[PDB]
Design a protein around this ligand. Structure first.
Ligand SMILES: [Mg+2]
Ligand SMILES: [Mg+2]
Ligand SMILES: [Mg+2]
Ligand SMILES: [Mg+2]
Ligand SMILES: [Mg+2]
Ligand SMILES: [Mg+2]
Ligand SMILES: [Zn+2]
Lengths: 733, 733
DNA sequence: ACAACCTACTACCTCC
DNA sequence: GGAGGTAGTAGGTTGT
DNA sequence: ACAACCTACTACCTCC
DNA sequence: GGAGGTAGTAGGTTGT
């Protein structure tokens, strides 16, 4: 349980660190311009307090406005984050910047052309303090940009431009490269015709726009010839696209763009299958390739300067190698609580007994008492009419096979209701058409009068307008219908024993999803954690609004129960823990549980804000509950070059690897755990992450209810809070 | 049915009208600055098409950028609105502007000081085309501004400033008058302490801010002495208020303000009772005072120039004088459908029989079959603990008297359930405290286990933090509780026969509200309108978000039914009629009504947008329904100097007066009806407002369900859509 | 060159 | 939209 | 001086 | 917060 691992950190020279810094206060108003952060960057400093406009600089200020000397403190008196940012700024001042590192890296990884796009390497940097030393963290990435403008790409043809804009509807963005500041625009399509909104023959406006761009932004001899080389001569036979800015405040302003001054943003959708596979294999590097590239780059840096005094840093990691099957509980042979380990099986082989008698029978553990009194559950099959008359029959017979096999296997051993499928429940409609959806909704309302729950298996085409999908799901949810969607590409996936059945992998996943959505828990956990309630919290935007619904809290009370609650409605990303916790108390008050004197573990997907801190402190002071908070981060610049479950104690954080990558390309991304806090009687104190906390987090990372081959990274409460806020954002119930 | 009335319009000279205009196209991008409308105003023109940047100017352009000549059309070829705006701009160019008219008006109405505020007259202008002539519409108003800064107002005392900021919490705004552009700021209070957030002793920052404002905005000798005269010498013993801008985008930026460079915005709340009454009597002018002021102003204008060629214009108005009691239906003497006219009564005397036997007994008309099978309806009384031990007893005994009288009067004649009041249902809690609300909610959840509906009568204090009110209402609504709130000021209102009972007016209103909220319709209408469905639509903001919930549609199907629907969630003010009408069809599909081949009358509170037009056209084309749309406007600059129900056909609009003012101060504001449209098979045509349409609108303006003495202006569907969008915005159910 | 993060969309590769 | 991983592209929020 | 409108808060005056 | 009127104060959206 101890292994040597390599990271992407290099130790820096200790003579870069400054001796003492100066604190300065800027007297200025934020409605005149020149943001404070830009000022602090100009004078080689950082921002300590943005409210009071206090900045820290290793030298005397050179500002023009009003400032005042505040303090002359030592470097070691600063917190760790400010020290890291100051060291990063100093490194940037000494030539160790992302741009220079990327330029050096281009000597070992030349730019590569994929179709009409070009891929160029890039390096991101960070600074980390560990063991009293400062390390530079280097992250490898790529940048893909288009090389041909839209007119050159379509081949100078108006029909080609129209077809290109029509095919990539919803995933197309244009960037105007003929102006000073580049803005990303989204084209405008007719709301009912589904056609791009162009201006066919207005050559006068084409010439006027061309001359306006020429004599306003490129008004200098070398700039003039650069413009004429980059864009060429004006083509008067081109249309004019009518678009709107991607900002979410200038959408009420429509702009006319020539399809010659703009380039397309990259979306994997604008590449064929071969090029998509090649580019995805090219971008997703492995551990050894990253190690080799970083070693060559570091050698080139060290042979050029004296700042870096080491190489890829080796650290100590503790390897988790417990047996999780001992903690997973299931029932077999008519209600006998057992474990997966004792049955020489795994979580992935819990449906194999439905056709082969060699393997043992594994029954579900807890069937809810509500899904036992129902006599019949209507089953509906909805097949899209845009299929090829063979995918339709395949979809129907596969759905019938799945339902029949599930019923026959489940009814033999355990009690289970009748999932009745009838010829009056199969519908073939056009999904895009609006009248058919209304007729289907009315028919489903009429057919489910004497019923409580219903299940619908839907078969759709390869791509949908992405709003018809949500509308269909919402219309089904409004009448108590659990919908399972299978598209055409999945239906085209073939087995290898008989081509008349779906892939066994997809079949098992489909049974698992049906059972989970119905409410049946196939397996549970065994372990006791020290808390009575675990609350996972997440935030998401609001789908066409500058607000944030951003409210979801999964209380995993019981490890079993999964009940969610909605927080409310916010303006930014800051949960209101006061109202949230008042509703928190009220709900188990109505259930009959006193939420006083208990312990609550809060897992937030992101970072806890100051307002949430104050709300939690007030709630603990008033209602008398002990609160424990954790910060979980999924995206950072640190990579651990290993493929195994482990955890690394670095600085004041714990980098966990709760999963193993199954693919042969890609470096696993660790999960950062930081800022453990304890709130008691209105007092907030910091704590240290114990091994028990890491064990509890790793155990919560198991227990997925969506797939049998899942290896998810986040804990269960956070993942399910994310899914619940997904559901609330898109309006599903 | 024909009366001469006076308006606030004066005929202009016909030689002001221009001969021909020029259309110009501006080639510019809207991310560089200098808005198009400002340009068009500079060159004495108007904006025709803002998307294509087309402007109309009575002279040749003098622009500096790129423009192009588009057309040279005649004046008479323009639509009416563009002609009105062009005439308004020309009048402004010829000296007839709001500023000059207000300055002239100040000679007859001198500024008046009310406490620390000053009231100054003001005149607003508009242009209207009628009968081929152009009229100037003049509206009289007032403007109230503070004369003393905050420091001078509080008397240069920190305790006084703290108390002033604490007392006017939530309704206080400061405007910074020491800068170039004036911004309105809102102070910041502690979230739990309820105290203003100041900075007590930081005289260094006070001096620095003073010098920063002095040497940046007032940097010129006469400007320097003006600054020193307006603000005086710097007081180093003053605190610093920490506030945020009222913009709804810069709230994430905190600004420090000296309480010497800011003035308070006017809110009637910063005046005592005597001054409030005096200022409200002073602002609310009557018809004769307005006529005299306008006549003197018009005489002064005519004696100075030759543009105005007339005086206050007399027009023709048709006076409605029908008997509405013939159309109101009610039941009396054990289910006998009668009318109010035949019983020599009015809508206001339908509760007098509960204590005096001289007047006839008037029973309700339709009691829902759902409010008949209930055995008992629990009644709760909630009394605030911040009262004076006498208002509490008055509240309890008044509520008991109301419930007892209602039950005793209703049970004698018609069937009605038991509104059981018990000593276990009276609670005295502190409303502001948070623990008490949770305890009360838990107790109410426990007490209403074996129940369906409940009614709660709440007695509160004079003022509440305005969020505790909404929280209490939401918590009661979540558990099926209809709440009726009576504050302390209403409870202090005395009768004139016995001081131990509430005012008869308020009592009758309270029983009416209880009966309406329970769901009982005391009276209905008799008349048949030509439509099968009337849909009222409204929009409101979203309560701390830059989104617009803005979704409410009352389908008044039946005149009786009142069922609402929620439209959805928008970004601006533009209803999505496609999704709205799909849900529209689905709902009566589930009820069993085919919404095809019918006629629908849409009343929108505001103006129908282009997107709603296209959506309605598409829906009519697809589902085959005839749509009739109306535009209703409540705020304009036109006044009819009369007090009687009538309608005036002016230009292409109808100005209705569906109500009569009961007070002795104020001029009634007419309702503008315009832009009647008929959508059939995807074709949108304009129509002319018939007398039948005006009669139908006037009839819909009756039948209020909130008060017995109501004289509301808007039609019932629009008013109830407004109330429903109120309910959705604040989260009540 | 404001740094650390979080969204919303993509696309391929793997599992009993 | 079999669901989990990992790649990219644009947008927003929070520091105190 | 972009014009017409719509919000959200206020405050008094009237009714059988 | 008896509800409808009429007064003011700041903010936003739509023109096509
Ligand atoms: Mg799913
Ligand atoms: Mg999050
Ligand atoms: Mg999330
Ligand atoms: Mg409105
Ligand atoms: Mg409204
Ligand atoms: Mg009310
Ligand atoms: Zn916004």
């Amino acid at each position: 349980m101890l292994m040597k691992v390599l990271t992407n950190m290099v130790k820096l020279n200790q003579d870069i660190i400054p001796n003492e810094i100066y604190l300065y206060k800027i007297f200025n108003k934020p409605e005149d311009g020149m943001n404070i952060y830009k000022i602090a960057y100009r004078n080689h400093g950082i921002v300590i307090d943005p409210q009071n406009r206090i900045i820290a600089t290793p030298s005397e200020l050179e500002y023009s406005g009003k400032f005042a000397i505040e303090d002359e403190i030592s470097f070691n008196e600063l917190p760790e984050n400010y020290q890291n940012r100051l060291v990063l700024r100093i490194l940037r001042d000494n030539g160790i910047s992302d741009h220079a590192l990327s330029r050096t890296l281009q000597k070992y990884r030349k730019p590569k052309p994929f179709g009409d796009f070009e891929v160029i390497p890039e390096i991101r940097s960070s600074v980390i303090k560990h063991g009293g030393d400062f390390y530079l963290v280097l992250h490898l990435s790529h940048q893909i940009r288009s090389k041909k403008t839209l007119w050159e790409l379509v081949g100078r043809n108006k029909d080609a431009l129209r077809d290109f804009l029509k095919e990539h509807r919803g995933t197309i963005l244009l960037r105007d490269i003929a102006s000073e500041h580049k803005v990303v625009y989204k084209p405008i399509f007719k709301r009912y015709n589904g056609d791009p909104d162009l201006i066919e023959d207005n050559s006068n406006d084409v010439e006027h726009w061309y001359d306006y761009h020429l004599e306003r932004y490129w008004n200098t001899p070398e700039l003039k010839k650069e413009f004429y080389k980059k864009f060429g001569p004006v083509d008067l036979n081109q249309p004019i696209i009518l678009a709107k800015p991607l900002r979410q405040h200038n959408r009420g302003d429509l702009v006319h763009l020539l399809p010659q001054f703009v380039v397309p943003v990259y979306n994997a959708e604008q590449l064929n299958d071969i090029l998509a596979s090649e580019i995805l294999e090219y971008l997703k590097l492995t551990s050894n390739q990253r190690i080799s590239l970083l070693s060559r780059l570091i050698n080139d840096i060290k042979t050029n300067t004296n700042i870096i005094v080491s190489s890829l840093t080796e650290l100590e990691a503790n390897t988790f190698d417990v047996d999780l099957n001992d903690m997973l509980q299931v029932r077999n042979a008519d209600n006998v609580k057992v474990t997966l380990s004792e049955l020489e099986i795994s979580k992935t082989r819990l449906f194999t007994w439905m056709k082969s008698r060699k393997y043992p029978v594994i029954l579900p553990y807890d069937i809810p008492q509500k899904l036992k009194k129902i006599e019949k559950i209507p089953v509906f099959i909805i097949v899209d009419s845009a299929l090829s008359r063979d995918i339709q029959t395949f979809a129907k017979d596969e759905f019938r096979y799945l339902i029949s096999s599930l019923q026959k296997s489940l009814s033999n051993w355990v009690d289970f209701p009748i999932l009745d499928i009838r010829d009056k429940y199969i519908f073939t409609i056009d999904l895009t058409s609006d009248k058919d959806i209304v007729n289907l909704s009315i028919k489903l309302v009429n057919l489910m009068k004497n019923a409580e729950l219903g299940l619908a298996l839907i078969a759709t085409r390869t791509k949908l307008p992405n709003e018809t999908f949500d509308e269909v799901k919402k219309r089904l949810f409004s009448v108590n219908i659990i919908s399972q969607v299978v598209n055409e590409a999945t239906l085209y996936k073939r087995d290898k024993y008989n081509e008349s059945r779906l892939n066994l992998y997809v079949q098992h996943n489909l049974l698992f999803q049906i059972l989970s959505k119905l409410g049946i828990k196939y397996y549970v956990l065994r372990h006791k954690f020290s808390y009575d309630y675990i609350v996972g919290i997440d935030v998401t935007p609001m789908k066409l609004s500058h607000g944030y619904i951003g409210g979801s809290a999964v209380m995993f009370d019981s490890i079993r129960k999964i009940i969610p609650v909605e927080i409310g409605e916010q303006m930014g990303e800051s949960i209101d823990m006061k109202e949230f916790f008042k509703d928190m108390v009220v709900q188990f008050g109505k259930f009959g549980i006193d939420l006083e004197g208990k312990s609550i573990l809060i897992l937030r997907d992101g970072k806890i804000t100051k307002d949430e801190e104050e709300g939690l402190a007030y709630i603990s002071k008033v209602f008398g509950i002990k609160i424990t908070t954790f910060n979980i981060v999924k995206r950072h610049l640190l990579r651990i070059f290993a493929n195994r479950k482990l955890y690394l104690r670095l600085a004041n954080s714990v980098y966990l690897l709760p999963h193993r990558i199954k693919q042969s390309v890609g470096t696993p991304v660790p999960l950062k755990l930081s800022e453990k806090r304890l709130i008691l009687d209105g007092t907030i104190t910091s704590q240290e992450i114990t091994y028990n906390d890491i064990f509890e987090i790793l155990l919560l990372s198991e227990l997925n209810y969506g797939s049998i081959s899942a290896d998810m990274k986040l804990p269960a409460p956070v993942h399910y809070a994310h899914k619940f806020v997904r559901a609330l954002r898109k309006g599903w119930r």
